[PDB]
């Protein structure tokens, strides 16, 4: 019942959550718990938090009307990481690796 393009998006999402990518995907599995991590400035700096569990809920609830809306949330999640963290931080290295997985497979969108 997902559109053909949203089926491809759901496939990508499943891959980002799969064991294959867990070594660098794990920081993006759930909403950043700023208080738990001691990041008491996180919500002053990041106005629109996003994470893969939220993307999954939105896909299941048919919130995304097209691939573009799905991709905007996945890229918002990476952008938040690049905005908050210094560019040489291990969490940013993990973001760059998972975004490479995302962008190369998003590029294979059926049309």
Site for ligand P4M in 14-33 (CB under 6 A): 27-28, 32
In the complex, the smallest distance separating the C-beta of residue 66 from ligand P4M, rounded to whole angstroms, is 25
Cβ–Cβ contacts within 10 Å for residue 55, how many?
A: 23
The binding track of 31-70 with respect to ligand P4M, each residue x by CB under 6 A or -, is: -x----x---------------------------------
The Cα-based distances of 72 to 38, 50, 51, 67, 68 in angstroms read: 28, 10, 12, 9, 6
Largest Cα–Cα distance of the chain, in whole Å?
A: 44
Binding site for ligand P4M (CB under 6 A): 27-28, 32, 37, 81, 84-85, 89, 91
């Amino acid at each position: 019942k997902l559109s053909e393009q949203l089926k491809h998006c759901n496939g990508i999402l499943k891959e980002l959550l799969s064991k294959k990518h867990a070594a660098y995907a794990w920081p993006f599995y759930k909403p950043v718990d700023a208080s738990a991590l001691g990041l008491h400035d996180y919500h002053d700096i990041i106005k629109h938090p996003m994470d893969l569990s939220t993307v999954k809920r939105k896909m299941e609830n048919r919130d995304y009307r097209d691939a573009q809306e799905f991709a905007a949330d996945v890229r918002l999640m990476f952008s938040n990481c690049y905005k908050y963290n210094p560019p040489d931080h291990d969490v940013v290295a993990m973001a760059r690796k998972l975004q490479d997985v995302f962008e190369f497979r998003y590029a294979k969108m059926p049309d």
